[PDB]
Design a protein around this ligand. Structure first.
Ligand code: CA
Ligand code: CA
Ligand code: CA
Ligand code: NA
Ligand code: NA
Ligand code: ZN
Lengths: 339, 78
């Protein structure tokens, strides 16, 4: 009677390709299988928190249409749905995704869901500060409180962490320490390409002091100029769901290839800064002439099994298949306790 | 209240602007026009933060985006 309408297990629901929209379907499958987020929408907790006047929001329309899509995908009435209504809202508020990169769409959805659900209805303007010699715990706590005074949402709760940023001016040697929120991490891969690297090594690269490129200088207040400072990041506070983007497109564009390193990432028990994480979803990218193709692996919250989502098709998967060179964005969920 | 912010042009040049947190994005685009001659309808302003890359829209203020003294905005032609 209706293509796609079939009584199915909730969440085991594909997404039709609308014409080069697999970058979007792959992202949606990762977010759909982030259990604190999907449960928040299915239990209608979002209705009370929609923020229609947020000057940085999308009038609540991104959260509303995302919630309606999630409710379809988890209704049990579909083997796939066509996310036209959601795609229309995305194109309306982010026209760069019309006629792409899975990570950039993810960044936009995390931003748009946050503002559409931001509990702060009248945001104070806040002058942010650096450490000024105060202990790290004091400055981090102040930074998180300043963040929360303007940004308080289910997205902050689930996805937002903190790192410590140390910038050193090469000319006056001034050191500036700030604590800066994030909602995902982009990890570099070794250059030149290695055939195999553990995820922990890419995290180590991420927290390695690096001189800022001449294309991204940092204003030094002492020198009163933009300088190629070095920047050192330390992961300070990690969120319940950590989104880890592998920077595979590290080549200069004329090479027309990507870093196909086998990045070995844990299925279970990725340990970082005293936290233990388990994988819940992977966005894959396969190389191809027209920007390639995106798919996803995800663990279903209701049966604990892994599945493979290729646009409209959903199939069983095994975790032994998941670590491959196609892995591009990893979703990790913090374990409640350990040991 | 007055403060200095910077705009990085597509060339890589840093423009210096004198602003207040209450200034509108349209007014910021006008100040960019005054100095670079780029019409505001062609200006795309991005505020790159560690947790968001927000496109600045007409009808909001610098304050709406928590733009700080000596912040840098990226200007894209589009
Ligand atoms: Ca889980
Ligand atoms: Ca474990
Ligand atoms: Ca395993
Ligand atoms: Na840059
Ligand atoms: Na003016
Ligand atoms: Zn300096």
């Amino acid at each position: 009677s209706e293509p796609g309408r079939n009584n199915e297990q909730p969440g085991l629901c594909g997404l039709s390709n609308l014409g080069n929209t697999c970058f979007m379907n792959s992202a949606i499958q990762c977010l759909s299988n982030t259990p604190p987020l999907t449960e928040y929408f299915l239990n209608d907790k979002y209705q009370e928190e929609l923020n229609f006047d947020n000057p940085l929001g999308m009038r609540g329309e991104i959260a509303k249409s995302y919630a309606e899509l999630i409710k379809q995908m988890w209704s049990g009435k579909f083997s796939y749905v066509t996310p036209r209504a959601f795609k229309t809202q995305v194109g309306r508020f982010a026209p760069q995704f019309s006629g792409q990169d899975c990570q950039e769409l993810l960044a936009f959805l995390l931003d748009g869901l946050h503002e559409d659900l931001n509990r702060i209805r009248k945001k104070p303007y806040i002058q942010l500060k650096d450490a000024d010699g105060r202990p790290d715990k004091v400055v981090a706590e102040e930074a998180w409180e300043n963040h929360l005074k303007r940004n308080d949402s289910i997205i902050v709760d689930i996805f937002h962490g903190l790192f410590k940023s140390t910038l050193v001016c090469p000319e006056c040697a001034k050191i500036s320490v700030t604590f800066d929120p994030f909602c995902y991490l982009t990890l570099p891969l070794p250059m030149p390409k290695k055939p195999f690297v553990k995820l922990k090594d890419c995290i180590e690269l991420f927290t390695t002091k690096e001189k800022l490129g001449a294309e991204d200088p940092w204003y030094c207040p002492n020198c009163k100029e933009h300088q190629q400072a070095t920047k050192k990041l330390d992961l300070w506070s990690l969120p319940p769901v950590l989104v880890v983007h592998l920077k595979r497109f590290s080549y200069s564009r004329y090479m027309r290839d990507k870093l196909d390193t086998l990045v070995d990432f844990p299925i279970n028990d990725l340990d970082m800064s005293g936290c233990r994480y388990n994988l819940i979803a992977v966005s894959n990218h396969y190389g191809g002439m027209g920007g390639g193709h995106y798919t996803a692996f995800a663990k279903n919250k209701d049966d604990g099994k892994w599945y493979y989502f290729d646009d409209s098709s959903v199939s069983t998967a095994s975790e032994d298949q998941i670590v491959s060179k196609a892995a591009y964005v990893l979703f990790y969920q913090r374990q409640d306790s350990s040991g | 209240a007055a403060m200095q912010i910077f705009v990085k042009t597509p060339t890589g040049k840093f423009i210096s602007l004198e602003v207040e947190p209450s200034d509108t994005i349209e007014n910021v685009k006008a100040k960019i026009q005054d100095k670079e001659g780029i019409p505001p309808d062609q200006q795309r302003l991005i505020f790159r933060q560690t947790w968001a890359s927000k496109q600045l829209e007409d009808g909001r203020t610098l304050s709406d985006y928590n733009i700080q003294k000596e912040s840098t905005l990226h200007l894209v032609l589009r």
